[PDB]
Amino acid sequence: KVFGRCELAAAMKRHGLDNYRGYSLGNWVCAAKFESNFNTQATNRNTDGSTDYGILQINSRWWCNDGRTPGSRNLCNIPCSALLSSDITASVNCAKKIVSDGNGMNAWVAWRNRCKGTDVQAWIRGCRL
């Protein structure tokens, strides 16, 4: 599924991400835009051999099991393929764990490089929330 901007903001808001650990909704929407272009099916390989999965590009190095990332962890206790559903629940619940771990949203490289310190409210402008 490729979410619309306001469609995803609303889904994210329903799932409790608005101001989760102090990150406004616009941060999460911005992160998803640059991580996946709002595409729940997005997958990208990392140089180390891990893979990033889904709308928030959750990494098999630490967070999910894909059976082909030697040495990795599965801290969200989920198969990586479950993070590719058109329902964003699994991705959001794992994202809550990631963002609580110490680094906040700096865990998402795209957030840090493209969203952090910018006018993130623009991403929810005009949306019924």
Residue closest to 27 by CA, chosen among 109, 124, 128: 124
- Applying the rule CB under 5 A, the residues between 47 and 86 that interact with Cl ion are 69, 85
Beta-carbon contacts of 49 under 8 Å, excluding residues fewer than 6 positions away, are 68, 69, 70
Residue 22 has, within 13 A of its CA and on its CB side, a CA count of 5
Q: Does 69 bind Na ion (CB under 5 A)?
A: yes
Residue ranges in 74-103 that form contacts with Na ion under rule CB under 5 A:
74
According to the binding rule CB under 5 A, does residue 36 interact with Na ion? no
Whether 48 has a binding-site annotation, put simply, is no
Q: Taking a C-beta distance cutoff of 8 angstroms, is the pair 128, 6 a contact?
A: yes
Q: Is 7 a catalytic residue?
A: no
By CB under 5 A, the count of residues binding Cl ion is 14
Which active-site residues does the annotation give?
35, 52
Which residues are at the interface with Cl ion (CB under 5 A)?
11, 24-26, 69, 85, 87-90, 104, 120-121, 124
